[PDB]
């Protein structure tokens, strides 16, 4: 079967550069030539113990685009089979006797890995586990970078915003670090800097990275400007007021930009990307969200269909 057939997709750290490339190549194929009946007769559980409308709709749509059926739930405000009294183990032990695969988002780190230990032959795909992993967001981000830049090696990548708590920037950084010659620029408030452990990881791989106070210092040499939402709730209102300027983008900040440069944002943006950016050829966060359907389709196909007649 293909390398990912029946595999659990829990963490970007358990995926090789070849695994990433295979997912991206499959996504490109499904984007170019749709297979609406590929997963006909498969029933998938969309289990959002933690509600997340954008991610759930995206995943569910991907399931339907391959012809699979969907059962599931969200906002576990209680959800007796999920948080109440019953263990997650028991919830998975039951769910895994009903479906062909489980896509799950949970507020606690390691939830998806735990599920894997009680799901038997049923693959589990991690849609978000606390502040740990979110592998499919990284896959759609890589896919979007590969598609717009033509590759995933030797890029100038800038990451802006809450680099400290952003699980998405942590894993995009680790995923790009499996490729060669990438150069990173980290623009963030001291209170929210890229953690030391990601830094140590990059030094060990001999990968270049620098810190910058603002976007303008680097705007001229970046191929990808990846922005993240600075959670207002974390900072003091005044602190946020004093620091927000360097981490927000207007179209005027783009005068400098390379022609090929694309601005990405896992969303929601609102406080970090002015709407005047939307019309530039650089705005690519909505095309990025659209690519979530191709990346999630690739993942479900590879995991649920033995070979990939691609």
């Amino acid at each position: 079967a293909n390398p990912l057939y029946q595999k659990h997709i829990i963490s970007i750290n358990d995926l090789s550069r070849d695994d990433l490339n295979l997912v991206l190549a499959t996504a490109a194929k499904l984007k170019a030539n749709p297979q609406p009946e590929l997963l006909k007769h498969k029933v998938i559980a969309s289990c959002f113990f933690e509600a997340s409308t954008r991610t759930r709709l995206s995943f569910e749509t991907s399931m339907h685009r391959l012809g699979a059926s969907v059962v599931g739930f969200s906002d576990s405000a209680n959800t007796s089979l999920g948080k109440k009294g019953e263990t997650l183990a028991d919830t998975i032990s039951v769910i895994s006797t009903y479906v062909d695969a489980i896509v799950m988002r949970h507020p606690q780190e390691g939830a998806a890995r735990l599920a894997t230990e009680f799901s038997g032959n049923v693959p589990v795909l991690n849609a978000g586990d606390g502040s740990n992993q979110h592998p499919t967001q990284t896959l759609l981000d890589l896919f979007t970078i590969q598609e717009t830049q033509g590759r995933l090696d030797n890029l100038h990548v800038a990451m802006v915003g809450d680099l400290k708590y952003g699980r998405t920037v942590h894993s995009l950084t680790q995923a790009l670090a499996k490729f060669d010659g990438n150069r990173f620029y980290f623009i963030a408030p001291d209170a929210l800097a890229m953690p030391q452990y990601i830094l140590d990881m990059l030094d060990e791989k001999g990968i270049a990275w620098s810190l910058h106070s603002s976007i303008e210092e680097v705007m001229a040499e970046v191929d990808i400007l990846y922005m993240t939402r600075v959670q207002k709730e974390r900072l003091d209102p005044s602190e946020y007021a004093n620091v927000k300027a360097q981490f927000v983008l207007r179209a005027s900040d783009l005068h400098n930009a390379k022609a090929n440069m694309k601005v990405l944002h896992p969303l929601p943006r609102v406080d970090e990307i002015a709407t005047d950016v939307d019309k530039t050829p650089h705005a690519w966060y909505f095309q990025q969200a659209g690519n979530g359907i191709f990346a999630r389709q690739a993942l479900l196909a590879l995991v649920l269909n033995r070979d990939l007649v691609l």
């Binding site: 963490s11 997650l88 183990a89 606690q108 780190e109 390691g110 735990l114 606390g130 740990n132």
Partner: protein, 152 residues
């Protein structure tokens, strides 16, 4: 055997964990539930040593430890020696060495880790960092100093 000036305790066959630092012997018996057996057990705590000054000693009859099992002793009694005794004489002498994984006994310090409310055994991947040991939780994937994990 702990020889001083009168009665001394030697065993026919089984295992003898010697040179456990002080105040670690009771912890080993605890953590590794060594006394949950019907086999005879002999224990000396705060024994005089010279090889230090004090120490603990553990003797388990008709019970042997794999090399892997001996390695679990590394975080607590790094300098110990585990003796295989059969027919009354030491046939084996080993020292623990850092294992690659520590299961069941540590508790993940991340309070939001799923490992806590659940029927799973803790598990950390061991990573010596030439100064201390790093423990990465199999579940939440967070890494901590062994000094922090052992505090909990």
């Amino acid at each position: 055997t702990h020889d001083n000036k009168l009665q001394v305790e030697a065993i026919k066959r089984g295992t003898v964990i010697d040179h456990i630092p002080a105040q670690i012997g009771f912890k080993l018996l605890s953590l590794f539930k060594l006394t949950e057996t019907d086999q005879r057990i002999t224990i000396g705590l705060n024994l005089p040593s010279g090889e230090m000054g004090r120490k603990d000693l553990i003797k388990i009859e008709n019970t042997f430890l794999s090399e892997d099992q001996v390695d679990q002793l590394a975080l607590y009694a790094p300098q110990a020696t585990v003796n295989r005794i059969d027919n009354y004489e030491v046939v084996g002498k080993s020292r623990p060495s850092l294992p690659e994984r520590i299961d069941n006994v540590l508790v993940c310090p991340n309070s939001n880790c799923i490992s806590h409310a659940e029927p799973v055994s803790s598990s950390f991947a061991v990573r010596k960092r030439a100064n201390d040991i790093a423990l990465k939780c199999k579940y939440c994937e967070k890494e901590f100093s062994h000094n922090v994990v052992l505090a909990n």
